[PDB]
Design a protein around this ligand. Sequence first.
Ligand SMILES: [Cl-]
Ligand SMILES: [Cl-]
Ligand SMILES: [Cl-]
Ligand code: NA
Ligand code: NA
Ligand code: NA
Lengths: 68, 55
Amino acid sequence: SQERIKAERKRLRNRIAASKCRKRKLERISRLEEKVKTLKSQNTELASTASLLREQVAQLKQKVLSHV
Amino acid sequence: ERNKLAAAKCRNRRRELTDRLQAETDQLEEEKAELESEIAELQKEKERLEFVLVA
Ligand SMILES: [Cl-]
Ligand SMILES: [Cl-]
Ligand SMILES: [Cl-]
Ligand code: NA
Ligand code: NA
Ligand code: NA
């Protein structure tokens, strides 16, 4: 009759806490997925630039050797 | 008082997906740094070879 309303307040506080937890977690996950996507893109570009540079260094070294 | 317990329980429940994403993020950061360093080295080498060639 009066202890019960306090216990209902505690229950509601628990459900609220759990909801806020779930939200914070979902925002965190979403953010992490965005960061993983961005990093994948960047590393793709960088990997391309590195590959092209390796090709160019190979050609150059071949030329240098041709003059030995 | 109760917030520390609630946040602690919160960080523990179903932390496999968030841990996996965080780990993948770490790996991608490392790979990125390594690629940037490799590009720096490759550019220096390219310049030195272009320097040897003018002869
Ligand atoms: Cl409730
Ligand atoms: Cl989290
Ligand atoms: Cl979501
Ligand atoms: Na590489
Ligand atoms: Na190559
Ligand atoms: Na770096």
